[PDB]
């Protein structure tokens, strides 16, 4: 396997990164420190995760120790939905930079294609529980993202949770300055994303797979819901390789030429999840895992399904 993938800006992105959603502030500093010690050099962050200060604490220190150089790290963050207005984007980026204690990001993503009413609340809802949109559009937000590159705050920009028509909207802009470098999307054996991956890869956009373990800690998970980590078929593939099910689930997107960002705050799991460069899934394993697709999406909200830019009404 090679360990980084080339982006359109000429930078190389590590194919394995550490996710940080639901890594509690009081626990994430140690998580990130351990991750850097064991070899992670890509960290996936976001303003909405409410922990960027504590991630930043960890990074800055591993600099203070001389454990890693900033140029070796690949730090990703994301513009939250309440900041899609062109005049709010730079301040949102700068807040993330200040929290992370960094002078640039390697990649900055539009977190979702949906703009929400600006304000303090991450999820402004009306009295009936529907998200309150903003009067923003993908192209104007993208133009504001491009200014961040031209000001040196971020090295690359991309998107997350965009369907292929939303990607196309950006690509087709006459005055496009920067193509998206990455589309970060949910991807795992129960939601294999064959058509969107094919589309993105054909357009020279790198795909990052989020929730590769099925996000078992997501707050809306129902006890009856499928569980990747407990799937006995995946356990049997893992046993054949004397690996864990998590290790199989991480290796799987890597062999599809995807980037993958498993989350853990547990030191013993952070280290296990990185030990995926010493084995390969066979062609039969890959085919088998792909065959588990059920088009089963875990990361979506009912409250957002009426937004004009809700991404998941389209087939892909
Ligand atoms: N762009 C977006 O809209 C978006 C959406 C979702 C996710 N993401 C990103 O993708 C990252 C990964 O997705 P995710 O956090 O949803 O879920 P995930 O990585 O699929 O699963 C994380 C869960 O698996 C557990 N776990 C980790 N390693 C394990 C192992 N070796 N054995 C058993 N359990 C293990 C974790 O527990 P502990 O932490 O307690 O160890 C945690 O509960 C996020 O953290 C975030 O950075 C982005
Ligand atoms: O982002 C993470 O890592 C994990 O996710 C989350 C992370 C957080 F820190 C808080 C909430 C979520 C969450 O509720 N996620 C589900 C969504 N679905 C939608 C949706 F369908 C939209 F059309 C717009 C939108 F913005 C969302 S957010």
From Swiss-Prot:
Its EC number is 1.1.1.21, 1.1.1.300, 1.1.1.372, 1.1.1.54. The modification Phosphoserine is found at residue 3. Transmembrane segments: none annotated. Substrate binds at residue 111. GO terms for cellular component: cytosol; extracellular exosome; extracellular space; mitochondrion; nucleoplasm. It comes from Homo sapiens. This is Aldo-keto reductase family 1 member B1. Keywords: Acetylation, Cytoplasm, Lipid metabolism, NADP, Oxidoreductase, Phosphoprotein. The active site is at 49 (proton donor).
